[PDB]
Paper text:
Dystrophin is a large (427 kD) multidomain protein expressed in skeletal and cardiac muscle where it binds to the dystrophin-associated glycoprotein (DAG) complex of the plasma membrane and to F-actin connecting the cytoskeleton to the membrane. Utrophin (Utr), the 395 kD autosomal homologue of Dys is widely expressed in non muscle tissues (reviewed) but is restricted to the myotendinous and neuromuscular junctions of differentiated muscle and is located at the sarcolemma of developing fetal muscle. Dys and Utr potentially act as cellular biomechanical shock-absorbers limiting damage to the plasma membrane with the spectrin repeat domains acting as spring units by undergoing force-induced unfolding. Dys and Utr-SR1 adopt the canonical spectrin repeat fold comprising a triple helical bundle displaying an approximately cylindrical structure of overall dimensions ∼60 Å length and ∼9 Å radius (between backbone atoms).
Additionally we have determined the structure of a six amino acid longer version of the Utr-SR1 protein (amino acids 308–430, Utr-SR1-L) produced as a result of presumed proteolysis during crystallization experiments of an Utr N-terminal two spectrin repeat protein construct (Utr-SR1-SR2; 308–537). SDS-PAGE analysis of dissolved Utr-SR1-L crystals showed they contained a single 15 kD species. The Utr-SR1-L crystals are isomorphous with Utr-SR1 with insufficient space in the crystal lattice for the complete two domain SR1–SR2 structure. For the longer Utr-SR1-L structure we observe the start of the heptad repeat phasing for the next repeat domain SR2. The very C-terminus of Utr-SR1-L, corresponding to the N-terminus of SR2 helix A’, has rotated about the C-A’ helix axis, relative to homologous structures, forming an anti-parallel inter-helix interaction with a crystallographically-related molecule. It is likely that this rotation is a result of crystal packing rather than a reorientation of SR2 relative to SR1 although variation in domain orientation is observed for this protein family; a complete Dys/Utr-SR1-SR2 structure is required to conclusively define the inter-domain orientation.
Residue numbers in the entry: 309 to 430
The structure:
């Protein structure tokens, strides 16, 4: 019942996370040209908006797993399954969050740098 609904919500999250990881992995290196950097930067900001919008769902699933585990109604096998799912979900969410943020910093700095290199050639 609450096991079932946790499992449906975990599948929704993980389906979306696997693809967001793949998309992240497939974004190209930061381009040396300011018009290409604009588009990479613009693409990644939209991605960061996507991450943010999914953050409560990740936390919501992690909270549901935690409640199922503390409440005591589940088998030992199911608990080992849930604990491993929560541990890995949390590590994947966090890896993607850190790497995406680093990517955002680099694109921000690249775009500001390339723009200002245009400006000082007035
Ligand atoms: Mg943002």
């Amino acid at each position: 019942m609450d096991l079932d609904s946790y499992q449906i919500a975990l599948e929704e999250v993980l389906t979306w996370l696997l693809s967001a990881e793949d998309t992240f992995q497939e974004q190209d290196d930061i381009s040396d040209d300011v018009e290409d950097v604009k588009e990479q930067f613009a693409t990644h900001e939209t991605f960061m908006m996507e991450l943010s919008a999914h953050q409560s769902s990740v936390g919501s699933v992690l909270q549901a797993g935690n409640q199922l585990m503390t409440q005591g109604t589940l088998s030992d096998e199911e608990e080992f399954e849930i604990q491993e799912q929560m541990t890995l979900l949390n590590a994947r969410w966090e890896a993607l969050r850190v790497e995406s943020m680093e990517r955002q910093s680099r694109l921000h700095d690249a775009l500001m740098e390339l723009q200002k290199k245009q400006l000082q050639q007035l």
